[PDB]
UniProtKB/Swiss-Prot annotation, chain A:
Biological role stated in the UniProt entry: DNA-dependent RNA polymerase catalyzes the transcription of DNA into RNA using the four ribonucleoside triphosphates as substrates.
Domain of life per record: Bacteria
Shown part of the complete sequence: 1045 to 1094 of 1342
Subunit relationships: The RNAP catalytic core consists of 2 alpha, 1 beta, 1 beta' and 1 omega subunit. When a sigma factor is associated with the core the holoenzyme is formed, which can initiate transcription.
Protein name in the entry: DNA-directed RNA polymerase subunit beta
Gene name of the encoded protein: rpoB
């Protein structure tokens, strides 16, 4: 019944957002809740943001 | 009212990228007050120029591969995000890049505009492997402030949609890292009164003194609302 088929390939580039699941390697799960701006993040005496 | 204002003393420029700025005398409590309030404006609100659009010939999208080039097109775009550029006169400049033969394509291969200064000419953009291979592209630098992603920009304007135009995440804000200290002043007999060292770590473009001047301006313009309007 099939005369021809056209296969189209899309490329999505999804960046991280709240809801994306992340984890380490010791079974420590977690969900991003908010992307805090750089200005708001904690920083050590050296000045380098976490 | 004992209003005691600080003044800009010394700008220890260790490098064009990293520079210390000392500030004294500050009355007790104002060291951390300006320190952080300034750090915040200097991170986020500073205007700078950044590569927004690129258009390489023989390239229909960023995921494709160009012959005679070690980098995939994505990795070239990444290098152009971090290309240090200063436009003096206009807000938008489109620079042309043509180059051929065996060698690492540096930032100096771009044709410099009358009022455009490429701050790190030795900056890598692409690696040409084959002598036969030649690369051609049009790099649009626009000026903005903060960080404007390509995903935030592919969902607003989009009036002309020319196929072969690669949009790039704009890294407009020139300040990379910044951290203020507070140190003894050793002025007259004040003892309490000290200074404020703002260590700035920026790209090439924006000049340390220039930037702190702009950041103080932005703070005072936001304070118009609390002084004028009651």
């Amino acid at each position: 019944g099939v005369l021809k088929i056209v296969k189209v390939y899309l490329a999505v580039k999804r960046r991280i957002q709240p809801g994306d699941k992340m984890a380490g390697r010791h079974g420590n799960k977690g969900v991003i809740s908010k992307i805090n701006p750089i200005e708001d993040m904690p920083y050590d005496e050296n000045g380098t943001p976490v | 009212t004992e209003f005691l204002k600080p003044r800009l003393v010394d700008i220890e420029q260790v490098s064009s990228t990293h520079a210390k700025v000392t500030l004294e005398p500050l009355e007790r409590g104002f060291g951390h007050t300006l320190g952080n309030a300034l750090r915040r404006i200097l991170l986020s609100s500073m205007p700078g120029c950044a590569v927004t659009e690129v258009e390489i010939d023989g390239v229909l999208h960023e995921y494709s591969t160009k012959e005679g080039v070690q980098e995939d097109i994505l990795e070239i775009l990444l290098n152009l995000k971090g290309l240090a550029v200063r436009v003096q006169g206009k807000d938008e400049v489109i620079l042309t890049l043509n180059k051929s033969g065996i060698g690492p394509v540096t930032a100096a291969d771009i044709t410099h505009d009358g009022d455009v200064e490429i701050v790190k000419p030795q900056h890598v953009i692409c690696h040409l492997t084959d002598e036969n291979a030649s690369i051609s592209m049009r790099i649009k630098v626009q000026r903005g402030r903060g960080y404007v992603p390509a995903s935030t920009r592919i969902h607003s304007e989009e009036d002309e949609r020319p196929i072969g135009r690669l949009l790039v995440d704009a890294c407009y804000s020139p300040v990379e890292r910044i951290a203020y200290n507070v140190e003894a002043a050793r002025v007259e007999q004040r003892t309490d009164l000290d200074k404020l060292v703002i260590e700035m770590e920026t790209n090439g473009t924006i000049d340390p003194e220039e930037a702190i001047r702009r950041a103080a301006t932005i703070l005072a313009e936001q304070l118009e609302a609390f002084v004028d309007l009651r």
